[PDB]
């Protein structure tokens, strides 16, 4: 006899926040679709400013406990001042404001085209250009569709190797070599055999306090975190499992985009793997499957550089609507100590 | 709503908490749990209708400090509602503090008819897999709601325990719904105050790993068990490390009954509990004495607030590997 749909008891005057919640890998993202107040700027990185300095109490609620938790990530859609551009996007996490995008491309590409900010292709076509202004910039997302669902590709940005079979001495282990490259983020990239572990069977919390040494030694010694991986860099139809621990020992529910970008640029660099030439690279954390491709030489400075097509799916995963009772003590949302 | 496998009915949900511990009480697109009884109901569930379960509570839509309700009709004539709960690790028995947000939810969606205008609380009986319990709801529809322990007892007070970490520390055993071992957390050598939750975690771990070689968890205190108006502030770590957002509603009450025992606090006298978490606060009331075998018992009111935070629905793409969720582990 709830055949009406109602909200629950809220204070009238805090808008209603709706989400569409989706995921990319097993890593989630929440798109604000109403109820954030207008985020003023005449440019992306003045509204992304105004979000952290005015709107900063909206991000805590959708992205901080009781509404969100620990490893929820969120993006509110604005208008780009380029006229290329599909759709802007302001990026929320706990720790505060991100500029790489990565791979919640996919996501927001999908959307994108799923929500109508992108006309459908001609039926002829199956895959949609979508423009999307990061914080980074303006990326391009080919969505694969129907007159949809799909997968999704980007082109990472110039993708390099810092520094290859670098000693380190991590506290817990020896001296021990690892690789640094940036695939639009600095990771060290290490076996997890190496460090005595096996990716396969270990505890996360084995395989996050490894990483973590491992990112602590190289802060001192020499950086968003460490890619510890099955040691599969040798090319196959295999794919390659890799774990990303980045920031306060915080796990990626995905193959990280960058990862997938940095370990092609890591692969590409040692001759292991030529240009158009296609990995995939599974989570150690959930299973889920990146594809990695160097689709043409580049520079990033002196240094020489790789391009990397990224592709995978994002998946819808429903939609909520956030309200606040005006004596909740937790409002505007926690974080654990 | 986004593109969903038509086919796969909608789950919805309305997210509510208590003092930072979140519930989803699912509202539609559960399938009949066929039983005769509530017991029945709960087996069904868990044997058959579990990727449900793992839909609403795994990571992709929910996390590892995630809890479900669904409710059910009951057995007895008394109950307005039958409660299954849902957690990461199955499916829970105690009722717990969550009666403050089904007694709130089940009087603000009309599972009990509206109190008389002159009465300020309403009674709703929520059929728990424990038993019935009855919760007290503030209304004129919001407000604090309060419920009655089962008994509460002691069942061992300083006791020195072989911790792998510290040595030797006195721990005090008490039963408030389930078994606890309760420490100081400047006995461990940390301050409740201002310490990581790491920190906590893996000293009330130990403490709970050293107390089975001689139990639910372990709670930390702030060690102010003396009677005063100041609140005291408690850590409930328990299970699989997992940390409660709340003053433990069964927590409260073992430690009511634990005051009550080392003569600190008489019936009718009334602490508050703070969550070091969250900040929130339950407080406990020791209402009359009671036994539970050759055991004294103490009977405990139990009293917070449980605040709505929104409403989801929850939708499966027939494509996505992860559909019925997964877990770290």
Not at 118 to 140: D, F, K, Q, S, Y
Request: charged share 20%; aromatic share 8%.
């Amino acid at each position: 006899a709830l055949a009406v749909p109602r909200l629950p008891p809220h204070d009238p005057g805090t808008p209603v926040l709706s989400v569409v919640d989706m995921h990319t890998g097993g890593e989630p993202l929440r798109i604000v679709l109403a109820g954030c107040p207008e985020v003023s700027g005449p440019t992306l990185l003045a509204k992304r400013r105004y979000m952290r300095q005015h709107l900063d109490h909206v991000r805590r609620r959708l992205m901080f406990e009781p509404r969100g938790h620990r490893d929820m990530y969120g993006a509110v859609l604005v208008p780009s001042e380029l006229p290329d551009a599909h759709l802007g996007v302001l990026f929320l996490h706990n720790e505060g404001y991100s500029s790489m995008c990565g791979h919640a491309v996919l996501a927001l590409g999908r959307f994108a085209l799923d929500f109508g900010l992108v006309p459908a292709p001609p039926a002829g076509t199956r895959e949609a250009r979508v423009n999307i202004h990061c914080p980074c910039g303006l990326v391009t997302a080919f969505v694969a569709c129907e007159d949809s669902h799909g997968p999704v590709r980007f082109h990472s940005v110039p993708a390099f190797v810092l520094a290859t079979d670098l000693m380190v001495d991590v506290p817990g282990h020896g001296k021990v070599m690892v690789d640094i490259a940036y695939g639009g983020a600095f990771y060290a990239f290490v076996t997890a055999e190496k460090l005595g572990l096996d990716i396969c069977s270990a505890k996360t919390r084995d395989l996050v306090d490894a990483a973590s040494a491992v990112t602590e030694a190289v802060k001192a010694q020499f950086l968003y975190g460490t890619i510890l991986t099955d040691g599969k860099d040798a090319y196959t139809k295999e794919p390659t499992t890799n774990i990303c621990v980045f920031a306060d020992e915080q796990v990626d529910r995905s193959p990280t985009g960058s990862g997938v970008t940095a370990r092609i640029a890591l692969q590409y660099h040692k001759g292991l793997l030529e240009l158009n030439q296609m990995r995939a690279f599974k989570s150690s954390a959930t299973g889920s499957v990146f594809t990695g491709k160097a689709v043409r030489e580049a520079k990033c400075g002196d240094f020489k550089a790789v391009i990397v097509e990224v592709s995978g799916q994002a998946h819808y995963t429903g939609t909520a609507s956030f309200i606040i009772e005006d004596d909740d003590p937790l409002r505007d949302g926690f974080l654990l100590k």
